[PDB]
Amino acid sequence: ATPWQKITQPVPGSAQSIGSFSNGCIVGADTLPIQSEHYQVMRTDQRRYFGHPDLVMFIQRLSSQVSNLGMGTVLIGDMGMPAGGRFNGGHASHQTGLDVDIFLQLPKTRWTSAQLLRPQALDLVSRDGKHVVSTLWKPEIFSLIKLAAQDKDVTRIFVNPAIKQQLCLDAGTDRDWLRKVRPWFQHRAHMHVRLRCPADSLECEDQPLPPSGDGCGAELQSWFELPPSCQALLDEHVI
Template identity: 40%
Template sequence: MQFKVIGFLLCAALAGCGGEDDPSKAETHAVKLSSSDHRLAKDLFGHVSTASKQNAESFGSYAKGCVGGAVQLPETGPTWQAMRLSRNRNWGQPILIDYLKDLSRKAAAQPGWEGLYIGDMSQPRGGPMLTGHASHQIGLDADIWMRAPKHLMLTVNDREHISSISMRKSAGAFVNDEWTEQHHNILKAAASDPRVARIFVFPGAKVQMCKDEKGDRAWLNKIRPWYGHHYHFHVRLNCPKGDKSCVNQAPPPKGDGCADAQDWVNNILNPPPPKPKDPNAPKPQPKAPITLATLPSQCSAVLSSR
Protein backbone atom coordinates (compact mmCIF):
# COMPACT_ATOMS: atom_id res chain seq x y z
CA MET A 1 0.00 0.00 0.00
CA GLN A 2 2.98 2.31 0.54
CA PHE A 3 3.57 2.77 -3.18
CA LYS A 4 -0.04 3.90 -3.52
CA VAL A 5 0.41 6.56 -0.88
CA ILE A 6 3.60 8.03 -2.29
CA GLY A 7 2.10 8.18 -5.76
CA PHE A 8 -1.17 9.63 -4.55
CA LEU A 9 0.45 12.37 -2.48
CA LEU A 10 2.67 13.31 -5.39
CA CYS A 11 -0.40 13.57 -7.58
CA ALA A 12 -2.13 15.68 -4.94
CA ALA A 13 0.80 18.05 -4.89
CA LEU A 14 0.56 18.40 -8.64
CA ALA A 15 -3.19 19.10 -8.40
CA GLY A 16 -4.46 16.10 -10.22
CA CYS A 17 -1.99 13.92 -12.12
CA GLY A 18 -1.96 15.30 -15.63
CA GLY A 19 -0.40 12.07 -16.89
CA GLU A 20 -3.23 10.16 -15.22
CA ASP A 21 -3.93 6.74 -15.14
CA ASP A 22 -3.33 3.67 -15.75
CA PRO A 23 -4.03 0.69 -13.45
CA SER A 24 -3.63 -1.89 -16.18
CA LYS A 25 -0.70 -3.89 -14.85
CA ALA A 26 -2.75 -7.06 -15.06
CA GLU A 27 -3.14 -6.73 -18.81
CA THR A 28 -1.32 -9.10 -21.12
CA HIS A 29 -0.60 -8.67 -24.78
CA ALA A 30 -2.23 -11.35 -26.92
CA VAL A 31 -1.75 -9.75 -30.33
CA LYS A 32 1.08 -10.40 -32.77
CA LEU A 33 3.52 -7.48 -32.85
CA SER A 34 5.44 -5.81 -35.63
CA SER A 35 9.20 -5.54 -35.29
CA SER A 36 10.19 -3.12 -38.05
CA ASP A 37 9.14 0.43 -37.12
CA HIS A 38 10.67 2.15 -34.12
CA ARG A 39 9.10 5.60 -34.55
CA LEU A 40 7.34 6.94 -31.47
CA ALA A 41 3.72 5.87 -31.65
CA LYS A 42 2.47 9.06 -29.98
CA ASP A 43 3.97 11.14 -32.80
CA LEU A 44 2.26 9.00 -35.42
CA PHE A 45 -1.17 8.71 -33.84
CA GLY A 46 -1.19 12.15 -32.24
CA HIS A 47 -1.17 13.98 -35.57
CA VAL A 48 -3.89 12.04 -37.43
CA SER A 49 -7.11 14.03 -37.66
CA THR A 50 -9.59 11.47 -39.01
CA ALA A 51 -10.61 7.89 -38.30
CA SER A 52 -9.57 4.97 -40.47
CA LYS A 53 -12.01 3.63 -43.06
CA GLN A 54 -12.30 0.20 -41.48
CA ASN A 55 -14.79 -1.78 -39.50
CA ALA A 56 -14.88 -0.68 -35.87
CA GLU A 57 -12.38 -2.80 -33.95
CA SER A 58 -9.98 -2.36 -31.07
CA PHE A 59 -6.46 -3.77 -31.28
CA GLY A 60 -4.44 -4.47 -28.15
CA SER A 61 -5.01 -3.26 -24.61
CA TYR A 62 -6.25 -0.03 -23.07
CA ALA A 63 -2.72 1.29 -22.54
CA LYS A 64 -1.07 -0.26 -25.60
CA GLY A 65 -3.16 -0.39 -28.72
CA CYS A 66 -5.19 1.46 -31.33
CA VAL A 67 -8.69 1.54 -32.81
CA GLY A 68 -9.90 1.14 -36.36
CA GLY A 69 -13.15 2.58 -37.67
CA ALA A 70 -13.67 4.90 -34.71
CA VAL A 71 -16.75 7.13 -34.52
CA GLN A 72 -16.72 10.77 -33.45
CA LEU A 73 -19.01 11.88 -30.64
CA PRO A 74 -20.91 14.91 -31.99
CA GLU A 75 -19.66 18.10 -30.39
CA THR A 76 -23.08 18.86 -28.93
CA GLY A 77 -26.16 16.74 -28.39
CA PRO A 78 -29.46 17.07 -26.53
CA THR A 79 -27.87 15.95 -23.25
CA TRP A 80 -24.11 16.39 -23.67
CA GLN A 81 -21.28 18.60 -24.87
CA ALA A 82 -17.78 17.44 -25.80
CA MET A 83 -15.06 19.56 -24.20
CA ARG A 84 -11.59 20.73 -25.29
CA LEU A 85 -12.42 20.25 -28.96
CA SER A 86 -8.96 21.40 -30.04
CA ARG A 87 -7.56 18.14 -28.72
CA ASN A 88 -9.65 16.10 -31.19
CA ARG A 89 -10.09 13.36 -28.62
CA ASN A 90 -13.86 12.84 -28.87
CA TRP A 91 -13.57 9.54 -30.76
CA GLY A 92 -14.30 5.96 -29.77
CA GLN A 93 -15.82 2.64 -30.59
CA PRO A 94 -19.55 2.84 -31.47
CA ILE A 95 -20.32 1.09 -28.19
CA LEU A 96 -18.65 3.98 -26.30
CA ILE A 97 -20.61 6.62 -28.23
CA ASP A 98 -23.88 4.81 -27.44
CA TYR A 99 -22.93 4.42 -23.79
CA LEU A 100 -22.14 8.10 -23.34
CA LYS A 101 -25.40 9.17 -24.97
CA ASP A 102 -27.32 6.77 -22.70
CA LEU A 103 -25.56 7.96 -19.56
CA SER A 104 -26.02 11.62 -20.47
CA ARG A 105 -29.78 11.09 -20.67
CA LYS A 106 -29.74 9.57 -17.20
CA ALA A 107 -27.66 12.48 -15.92
CA ALA A 108 -30.13 14.95 -17.39
CA ALA A 109 -32.83 13.40 -15.20
CA GLN A 110 -30.92 14.49 -12.07
CA PRO A 111 -31.91 17.81 -10.46
CA GLY A 112 -29.48 20.57 -11.47
CA TRP A 113 -27.90 18.59 -14.31
CA GLU A 114 -28.73 19.26 -17.97
CA GLY A 115 -26.61 16.31 -19.06
CA LEU A 116 -22.85 15.70 -19.15
CA TYR A 117 -19.67 17.46 -20.13
CA ILE A 118 -17.55 14.82 -21.84
CA GLY A 119 -13.77 15.13 -21.61
CA ASP A 120 -11.10 13.08 -23.35
CA MET A 121 -12.08 9.87 -25.08
CA SER A 122 -9.63 8.60 -27.73
CA GLN A 123 -7.81 10.06 -30.71
CA PRO A 124 -9.29 9.37 -34.18
CA ARG A 125 -7.24 6.18 -34.48
CA GLY A 126 -6.52 5.68 -30.82
CA GLY A 127 -2.95 4.93 -29.88
CA PRO A 128 -0.70 6.80 -27.44
CA MET A 129 -1.38 10.51 -27.04
CA LEU A 130 1.07 13.36 -27.39
CA THR A 131 0.24 14.51 -23.84
CA GLY A 132 -1.67 13.19 -20.87
CA HIS A 133 -3.15 9.76 -20.62
CA ALA A 134 -1.38 6.45 -20.55
CA SER A 135 -4.59 4.68 -21.53
CA HIS A 136 -7.52 5.83 -23.76
CA GLN A 137 -5.83 4.02 -26.66
CA ILE A 138 -8.47 1.63 -28.01
CA GLY A 139 -11.66 3.69 -28.08
CA LEU A 140 -13.20 2.31 -24.90
CA ASP A 141 -12.24 4.96 -22.28
CA ALA A 142 -13.87 8.31 -21.53
CA ASP A 143 -13.44 11.04 -18.93
CA ILE A 144 -16.65 12.61 -17.64
CA TRP A 145 -16.46 15.94 -15.86
CA MET A 146 -17.66 16.24 -12.29
CA ARG A 147 -19.01 19.70 -13.07
CA ALA A 148 -22.80 19.76 -13.37
CA PRO A 149 -23.80 21.33 -16.71
CA LYS A 150 -26.27 24.13 -16.03
CA HIS A 151 -26.81 24.54 -19.79
CA LEU A 152 -25.53 22.99 -23.02
CA MET A 153 -24.87 26.16 -25.00
CA LEU A 154 -21.12 26.51 -24.48
CA THR A 155 -19.26 27.90 -27.47
CA VAL A 156 -16.13 26.29 -28.85
CA ASN A 157 -14.10 28.98 -27.09
CA ASP A 158 -15.97 28.39 -23.81
CA ARG A 159 -15.06 24.73 -23.95
CA GLU A 160 -11.37 25.55 -24.23
CA HIS A 161 -11.32 27.73 -21.12
CA ILE A 162 -13.98 26.51 -18.72
CA SER A 163 -12.73 23.98 -16.18
CA SER A 164 -14.32 21.22 -14.20
CA ILE A 165 -14.66 21.37 -10.41
CA SER A 166 -12.62 19.37 -7.92
CA MET A 167 -14.58 17.17 -5.53
CA ARG A 168 -11.75 16.29 -3.15
CA LYS A 169 -10.67 17.43 0.31
CA SER A 170 -7.58 16.49 2.33
CA ALA A 171 -5.57 15.26 -0.66
CA GLY A 172 -8.41 13.01 -1.75
CA ALA A 173 -9.23 11.38 1.58
CA PHE A 174 -12.68 12.97 1.62
CA VAL A 175 -15.17 14.64 -0.68
CA ASN A 176 -15.67 18.39 -0.35
CA ASP A 177 -18.83 20.52 -0.27
CA GLU A 178 -19.19 20.34 -4.05
CA TRP A 179 -20.04 16.64 -3.84
CA THR A 180 -23.78 15.96 -4.10
CA GLU A 181 -26.29 13.15 -4.12
CA GLN A 182 -26.47 13.65 -7.88
CA HIS A 183 -22.79 12.71 -8.25
CA HIS A 184 -23.52 9.49 -6.36
CA ASN A 185 -26.53 8.73 -8.56
CA ILE A 186 -24.74 9.41 -11.83
CA LEU A 187 -21.76 7.26 -10.86
CA LYS A 188 -24.16 4.53 -9.78
CA ALA A 189 -25.91 4.67 -13.15
CA ALA A 190 -22.55 4.69 -14.92
CA ALA A 191 -21.26 1.62 -13.06
CA SER A 192 -24.52 -0.33 -13.23
CA ASP A 193 -24.36 -0.57 -17.03
CA PRO A 194 -23.17 -4.07 -18.04
CA ARG A 195 -20.95 -2.57 -20.75
CA VAL A 196 -18.68 -1.08 -18.07
CA ALA A 197 -15.50 -2.82 -16.92
CA ARG A 198 -14.57 -0.30 -14.21
CA ILE A 199 -14.71 3.36 -13.25
CA PHE A 200 -11.79 5.25 -11.70
CA VAL A 201 -12.37 7.94 -9.07
CA PHE A 202 -10.40 9.39 -6.17
CA PRO A 203 -10.44 7.29 -2.95
CA GLY A 204 -12.54 9.65 -0.83
CA ALA A 205 -15.38 9.52 -3.34
CA LYS A 206 -15.45 5.73 -3.30
CA VAL A 207 -15.51 5.68 0.50
CA GLN A 208 -18.31 8.26 0.56
CA MET A 209 -20.39 6.22 -1.89
CA CYS A 210 -19.82 3.13 0.23
CA LYS A 211 -21.17 5.01 3.27
CA ASP A 212 -24.17 6.45 1.46
CA GLU A 213 -25.40 3.46 -0.52
CA LYS A 214 -28.36 1.84 1.29
CA GLY A 215 -29.58 -0.46 -1.49
CA ASP A 216 -27.91 -2.85 -3.92
CA ARG A 217 -24.13 -2.56 -3.56
CA ALA A 218 -23.05 -4.73 -6.49
CA TRP A 219 -22.25 -1.70 -8.66
CA LEU A 220 -19.66 -0.50 -6.15
CA ASN A 221 -17.36 -3.30 -7.31
CA LYS A 222 -16.68 -1.42 -10.54
CA ILE A 223 -15.83 1.86 -8.79
CA ARG A 224 -12.07 1.72 -8.23
CA PRO A 225 -9.90 4.23 -6.34
CA TRP A 226 -7.04 5.72 -8.31
CA TYR A 227 -4.74 8.73 -8.32
CA GLY A 228 -6.19 12.05 -9.43
CA HIS A 229 -9.70 11.65 -10.83
CA HIS A 230 -11.27 14.33 -8.66
CA TYR A 231 -12.18 16.70 -11.52
CA HIS A 232 -13.60 13.86 -13.59
CA PHE A 233 -14.37 10.17 -13.38
CA HIS A 234 -12.94 7.76 -15.92
CA VAL A 235 -15.20 5.15 -17.50
CA ARG A 236 -13.67 2.06 -19.10
CA LEU A 237 -15.84 -0.29 -21.13
CA ASN A 238 -15.33 -4.00 -21.66
CA CYS A 239 -14.12 -5.16 -25.05
CA PRO A 240 -17.13 -5.55 -27.37
CA LYS A 241 -18.34 -9.10 -27.92
CA GLY A 242 -16.70 -10.68 -30.92
CA ASP A 243 -13.81 -8.20 -30.94
CA LYS A 244 -11.07 -10.83 -30.87
CA SER A 245 -8.13 -8.44 -31.11
CA CYS A 246 -9.16 -6.45 -28.03
CA VAL A 247 -7.52 -7.39 -24.73
CA ASN A 248 -9.67 -6.93 -21.63
CA GLN A 249 -8.18 -5.85 -18.34
CA ALA A 250 -8.45 -8.43 -15.57
CA PRO A 251 -11.80 -8.04 -13.75
CA PRO A 252 -11.87 -6.26 -10.39
CA PRO A 253 -11.53 -8.41 -7.25
CA LYS A 254 -14.79 -9.79 -5.89
CA GLY A 255 -16.75 -7.79 -3.34
CA ASP A 256 -17.70 -4.14 -3.15
CA GLY A 257 -14.09 -2.92 -2.78
CA CYS A 258 -14.98 -0.59 0.09
CA ALA A 259 -12.35 -1.94 2.49
CA ASP A 260 -9.63 -1.41 -0.12
CA ALA A 261 -10.78 2.17 -0.71
CA GLN A 262 -10.71 2.79 3.03
CA ASP A 263 -7.11 1.53 3.09
CA TRP A 264 -6.22 4.15 0.49
CA VAL A 265 -7.83 6.84 2.64
CA ASN A 266 -6.15 5.64 5.85
CA ASN A 267 -2.77 5.77 4.17
CA ILE A 268 -3.40 9.26 2.79
CA LEU A 269 -4.19 10.48 6.29
CA ASN A 270 -1.40 8.53 8.00
CA PRO A 271 1.32 7.72 5.49
CA PRO A 272 3.60 4.85 6.53
CA PRO A 273 7.28 5.71 6.92
CA PRO A 274 9.33 5.31 3.74
CA LYS A 275 11.31 2.14 3.37
CA PRO A 276 15.07 2.55 3.88
CA LYS A 277 17.00 2.75 0.63
CA ASP A 278 19.11 -0.21 -0.35
CA PRO A 279 22.44 1.17 -1.65
CA ASN A 280 22.99 -2.06 -3.57
CA ALA A 281 19.61 -2.04 -5.30
CA PRO A 282 19.77 -1.44 -9.06
CA LYS A 283 18.61 1.97 -10.19
CA PRO A 284 15.10 1.94 -11.65
CA GLN A 285 15.11 2.16 -15.40
CA PRO A 286 12.86 4.61 -17.21
CA LYS A 287 9.90 3.06 -18.96
CA ALA A 288 10.60 2.51 -22.64
CA PRO A 289 8.44 4.66 -24.93
CA ILE A 290 5.81 2.97 -27.04
CA THR A 291 6.86 2.67 -30.66
CA LEU A 292 4.86 1.45 -33.63
CA ALA A 293 6.91 -1.74 -33.46
CA THR A 294 5.63 -2.51 -29.96
CA LEU A 295 1.96 -1.98 -30.80
CA PRO A 296 -0.20 -4.72 -32.30
CA SER A 297 0.75 -5.27 -35.93
CA GLN A 298 -2.75 -4.24 -37.04
CA CYS A 299 -2.00 -0.69 -35.89
CA SER A 300 0.19 -0.13 -38.95
CA ALA A 301 -2.84 -0.81 -41.15
CA VAL A 302 -4.95 1.49 -38.99
CA LEU A 303 -2.44 4.29 -39.55
CA SER A 304 -2.14 3.71 -43.29
CA SER A 305 -5.90 3.37 -43.96
CA ARG A 306 -7.45 6.23 -45.95
Protein backbone atom coordinates in the same frame (compact mmCIF):
# COMPACT_ATOMS: atom_id res chain seq x y z
CA ALA B 1 5.09 13.49 -31.88
CA THR B 2 3.68 10.12 -32.97
CA PRO B 3 1.64 9.62 -36.13
CA TRP B 4 -1.28 8.73 -33.82
CA GLN B 5 -1.18 12.20 -32.26
CA LYS B 6 -1.05 13.86 -35.66
CA ILE B 7 -3.78 12.25 -37.76
CA THR B 8 -7.05 14.20 -37.80
CA GLN B 9 -9.35 11.71 -39.52
CA PRO B 10 -10.25 8.19 -38.42
CA VAL B 11 -8.89 5.25 -40.42
CA PRO B 12 -11.84 4.12 -42.59
CA GLY B 13 -12.94 0.52 -42.01
CA SER B 14 -15.08 -1.72 -39.86
CA ALA B 15 -15.13 -0.51 -36.26
CA GLN B 16 -12.39 -2.52 -34.56
CA SER B 17 -10.75 -1.93 -31.16
CA ILE B 18 -7.28 -3.48 -31.30
CA GLY B 19 -5.03 -4.32 -28.38
CA SER B 20 -5.60 -3.31 -24.82
CA PHE B 21 -6.74 -0.12 -23.16
CA SER B 22 -3.13 0.84 -22.42
CA ASN B 23 -1.47 -0.31 -25.68
CA GLY B 24 -3.44 -0.36 -28.89
CA CYS B 25 -5.42 1.48 -31.47
CA ILE B 26 -8.76 1.55 -33.21
CA VAL B 27 -9.70 1.28 -36.85
CA GLY B 28 -12.91 2.80 -38.12
CA ALA B 29 -13.44 4.93 -35.03
CA ASP B 30 -16.78 6.72 -34.81
CA THR B 31 -17.05 10.47 -34.00
CA LEU B 32 -19.22 11.71 -31.12
CA PRO B 33 -21.71 14.27 -32.48
CA ILE B 34 -20.76 17.71 -31.12
CA GLN B 35 -24.33 19.02 -30.83
CA SER B 36 -26.69 17.11 -28.53
CA GLU B 37 -29.55 17.87 -26.18
CA HIS B 38 -28.22 15.63 -23.41
CA TYR B 39 -24.48 16.30 -23.35
CA GLN B 40 -21.69 18.65 -24.35
CA VAL B 41 -18.09 18.10 -25.48
CA MET B 42 -15.17 19.65 -23.62
CA ARG B 43 -11.77 20.54 -25.10
CA THR B 44 -12.62 19.61 -28.66
CA ASP B 45 -9.43 21.41 -29.57
CA GLN B 46 -7.56 18.32 -28.43
CA ARG B 47 -9.46 16.25 -30.98
CA ARG B 48 -10.08 13.41 -28.55
CA TYR B 49 -13.77 12.87 -29.18
CA PHE B 50 -13.43 9.73 -31.26
CA GLY B 51 -14.08 6.11 -30.31
CA HIS B 52 -15.77 2.80 -30.84
CA PRO B 53 -19.47 2.86 -31.78
CA ASP B 54 -20.10 1.24 -28.40
CA LEU B 55 -18.45 4.11 -26.53
CA VAL B 56 -20.47 6.65 -28.55
CA MET B 57 -23.74 4.75 -27.83
CA PHE B 58 -22.97 4.46 -24.14
CA ILE B 59 -22.51 8.24 -23.97
CA GLN B 60 -25.74 8.85 -25.82
CA ARG B 61 -27.51 6.29 -23.59
CA LEU B 62 -26.07 7.65 -20.33
CA SER B 63 -26.69 11.29 -21.22
CA SER B 64 -30.26 10.65 -22.25
CA GLN B 65 -30.96 8.95 -18.88
CA VAL B 66 -29.46 11.79 -16.83
CA SER B 67 -31.48 14.26 -18.85
CA ASN B 68 -34.75 12.38 -18.30
CA LEU B 69 -34.10 12.44 -14.56
CA GLY B 70 -33.69 16.19 -14.82
CA MET B 71 -30.21 16.10 -13.33
CA GLY B 72 -28.55 18.28 -15.93
CA THR B 73 -26.20 18.11 -18.90
CA VAL B 74 -23.39 15.59 -19.25
CA LEU B 75 -19.90 16.97 -19.90
CA ILE B 76 -17.68 14.70 -21.97
CA GLY B 77 -13.93 14.81 -21.55
CA ASP B 78 -11.25 12.73 -23.27
CA MET B 79 -12.37 9.69 -25.27
CA GLY B 80 -9.81 8.65 -27.87
CA MET B 81 -7.83 10.07 -30.77
CA PRO B 82 -8.93 9.56 -34.39
CA ALA B 83 -7.16 6.18 -34.50
CA GLY B 84 -6.58 5.68 -30.77
CA GLY B 85 -3.03 5.36 -29.44
CA ARG B 86 -1.24 6.77 -26.39
CA PHE B 87 -2.10 10.34 -25.45
CA ASN B 88 0.59 13.01 -25.55
CA GLY B 89 -0.48 14.25 -22.03
CA GLY B 90 -3.50 12.94 -20.09
CA HIS B 91 -4.51 9.52 -18.79
CA ALA B 92 -2.43 6.52 -19.90
CA SER B 93 -5.16 4.34 -21.49
CA HIS B 94 -7.90 5.49 -23.89
CA GLN B 95 -5.97 3.71 -26.63
CA THR B 96 -8.69 1.53 -28.09
CA GLY B 97 -11.72 3.83 -28.08
CA LEU B 98 -13.38 2.15 -25.11
CA ASP B 99 -12.48 4.65 -22.36
CA VAL B 100 -14.25 7.96 -21.66
CA ASP B 101 -13.64 10.68 -19.05
CA ILE B 102 -16.71 12.41 -17.74
CA PHE B 103 -16.73 15.61 -15.71
CA LEU B 104 -18.13 15.21 -12.19
CA GLN B 105 -20.29 18.34 -12.57
CA LEU B 106 -23.76 18.40 -14.10
CA PRO B 107 -24.65 21.91 -15.34
CA LYS B 108 -28.36 22.65 -15.41
CA THR B 109 -27.69 25.21 -18.10
CA ARG B 110 -25.67 24.44 -21.20
CA TRP B 111 -22.13 25.82 -21.18
CA THR B 112 -20.83 28.21 -23.89
CA SER B 113 -18.08 27.24 -26.36
CA ALA B 114 -15.48 29.19 -24.43
CA GLN B 115 -16.40 27.35 -21.23
CA LEU B 116 -16.20 23.96 -22.97
CA LEU B 117 -12.93 24.90 -24.63
CA ARG B 118 -11.22 25.76 -21.33
CA PRO B 119 -13.17 23.97 -18.59
CA GLN B 120 -12.77 25.22 -15.07
CA ALA B 121 -11.95 22.00 -13.22
CA LEU B 122 -13.98 21.54 -10.00
CA ASP B 123 -11.61 19.81 -7.53
CA LEU B 124 -13.89 17.60 -5.45
CA VAL B 125 -11.33 15.78 -3.34
CA SER B 126 -10.26 17.24 -0.05
CA ARG B 127 -7.02 19.09 0.54
CA ASP B 128 -5.48 16.07 2.22
CA GLY B 129 -6.97 13.51 -0.11
CA LYS B 130 -9.09 11.44 2.27
CA HIS B 131 -12.50 13.03 1.81
CA VAL B 132 -14.63 15.07 -0.56
CA VAL B 133 -15.36 18.77 -0.18
CA SER B 134 -18.88 18.61 1.32
CA THR B 135 -19.88 21.97 -0.10
CA LEU B 136 -19.19 20.85 -3.67
CA TRP B 137 -20.40 17.27 -3.53
CA LYS B 138 -23.96 17.15 -4.86
CA PRO B 139 -26.39 14.21 -4.77
CA GLU B 140 -26.45 14.32 -8.56
CA ILE B 141 -22.79 13.28 -8.79
CA PHE B 142 -23.57 10.21 -6.67
CA SER B 143 -26.40 9.35 -9.06
CA LEU B 144 -24.25 9.96 -12.09
CA ILE B 145 -21.61 7.47 -11.05
CA LYS B 146 -24.14 4.85 -9.92
CA LEU B 147 -26.01 5.07 -13.24
CA ALA B 148 -22.77 4.59 -15.15
CA ALA B 149 -21.64 1.73 -12.94
CA GLN B 150 -25.02 0.07 -13.59
CA ASP B 151 -24.65 -0.12 -17.40
CA LYS B 152 -23.89 -3.72 -18.39
CA ASP B 153 -21.31 -2.53 -20.87
CA VAL B 154 -19.21 -0.78 -18.19
CA THR B 155 -16.53 -2.88 -16.52
CA ARG B 156 -14.68 -0.27 -14.49
CA ILE B 157 -14.99 3.29 -13.23
CA PHE B 158 -11.86 4.99 -11.93
CA VAL B 159 -12.19 7.82 -9.39
CA ASN B 160 -9.99 9.30 -6.67
CA PRO B 161 -9.96 7.23 -3.47
CA ALA B 162 -11.79 10.01 -1.65
CA ILE B 163 -14.62 10.03 -4.13
CA LYS B 164 -15.15 6.29 -3.83
CA GLN B 165 -15.07 6.76 -0.07
CA GLN B 166 -17.96 9.25 -0.28
CA LEU B 167 -19.79 6.72 -2.47
CA CYS B 168 -19.23 3.87 -0.02
CA LEU B 169 -20.78 6.06 2.66
CA ASP B 170 -23.92 6.98 0.69
CA ALA B 171 -24.59 3.57 -0.93
CA GLY B 172 -26.54 2.07 1.94
CA THR B 173 -28.02 -1.30 0.94
CA ASP B 174 -27.76 -1.15 -2.84
CA ARG B 175 -23.99 -1.43 -3.17
CA ASP B 176 -22.83 -4.32 -5.35
CA TRP B 177 -22.21 -1.72 -8.09
CA LEU B 178 -19.40 -0.33 -5.94
CA ARG B 179 -17.22 -3.23 -7.13
CA LYS B 180 -16.92 -1.56 -10.56
CA VAL B 181 -15.59 1.61 -8.92
CA ARG B 182 -11.81 1.44 -8.73
CA PRO B 183 -9.57 3.93 -6.87
CA TRP B 184 -6.68 5.67 -8.64
CA PHE B 185 -4.33 8.66 -8.58
CA GLN B 186 -5.84 12.01 -9.46
CA HIS B 187 -9.25 11.60 -11.13
CA ARG B 188 -10.38 14.34 -8.77
CA ALA B 189 -12.67 16.08 -11.26
CA HIS B 190 -13.47 13.31 -13.76
CA MET B 191 -14.69 9.75 -13.46
CA HIS B 192 -12.91 7.37 -15.86
CA VAL B 193 -15.33 4.97 -17.57
CA ARG B 194 -14.06 1.82 -19.27
CA LEU B 195 -16.25 -0.46 -21.39
CA ARG B 196 -15.89 -4.21 -22.10
CA CYS B 197 -14.46 -5.28 -25.44
CA PRO B 198 -17.01 -5.18 -28.30
CA ALA B 199 -18.40 -8.64 -29.05
CA ASP B 200 -17.34 -8.66 -32.70
CA SER B 201 -13.89 -7.14 -32.03
CA LEU B 202 -11.56 -10.10 -32.41
CA GLU B 203 -8.21 -8.44 -31.62
CA CYS B 204 -9.35 -6.79 -28.38
CA GLU B 205 -7.92 -7.81 -25.04
CA ASP B 206 -10.24 -7.81 -22.01
CA GLN B 207 -9.41 -7.48 -18.31
CA PRO B 208 -10.19 -9.94 -15.52
CA LEU B 209 -13.04 -8.90 -13.24
CA PRO B 210 -12.18 -6.55 -10.36
CA PRO B 211 -11.76 -7.85 -6.79
CA SER B 212 -14.91 -9.17 -5.08
CA GLY B 213 -16.85 -7.02 -2.62
CA ASP B 214 -17.61 -3.31 -2.46
CA GLY B 215 -13.88 -2.79 -1.95
CA CYS B 216 -14.66 -0.15 0.66
CA GLY B 217 -12.43 -1.54 3.40
CA ALA B 218 -8.75 -2.44 3.40
CA GLU B 219 -7.95 -2.02 -0.30
CA LEU B 220 -9.51 1.43 -0.39
CA GLN B 221 -7.73 2.22 2.85
CA SER B 222 -4.35 1.33 1.39
CA TRP B 223 -4.91 4.37 -0.81
CA PHE B 224 -5.33 6.70 2.13
CA GLU B 225 -1.82 5.85 3.31
CA LEU B 226 2.43 -2.53 -30.16
CA PRO B 227 -0.10 -5.02 -31.57
CA PRO B 228 1.11 -6.23 -35.02
CA SER B 229 -2.14 -5.10 -36.53
CA CYS B 230 -1.63 -1.56 -35.19
CA GLN B 231 2.05 -1.44 -36.15
CA ALA B 232 1.03 -2.53 -39.64
CA LEU B 233 -0.93 0.72 -39.99
CA LEU B 234 2.38 2.46 -39.26
CA ASP B 235 4.62 0.23 -41.40
CA GLU B 236 2.38 1.02 -44.38
CA HIS B 237 1.78 4.72 -43.75
CA VAL B 238 -1.97 4.46 -43.18
CA ILE B 239 -1.95 6.68 -40.07
